[PDB]
Ligand binder design. Structure first.
Ligand SMILES: [Zn+2]
Ligand SMILES: [Zn+2]
Ligand SMILES: [Zn+2]
Ligand SMILES: [Zn+2]
Lengths: 29, 28
């Protein structure tokens, strides 16, 4: 399914952005 | 205690490095 494929990939990208965000914060505080 | 502190900070960087590697591999 094409909408499901876009959605699953987009969520994975969102989860990775959040991880990077949490990592950068750890190297600050 | 300085050696213990260095290892604990190293463990945290390794965990971040390892998650970074999973992201790059995952984006294949
Ligand atoms: Zn469809
Ligand atoms: Zn997106
Ligand atoms: Zn889900
Ligand atoms: Zn966020």
């Amino acid at each position: 399914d094409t909408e499901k494929l876009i959605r699953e990939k987009d969520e994975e990208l969102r989860r990775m952005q959040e991880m990077l965000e949490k990592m950068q914060a750890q190297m600050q505080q």
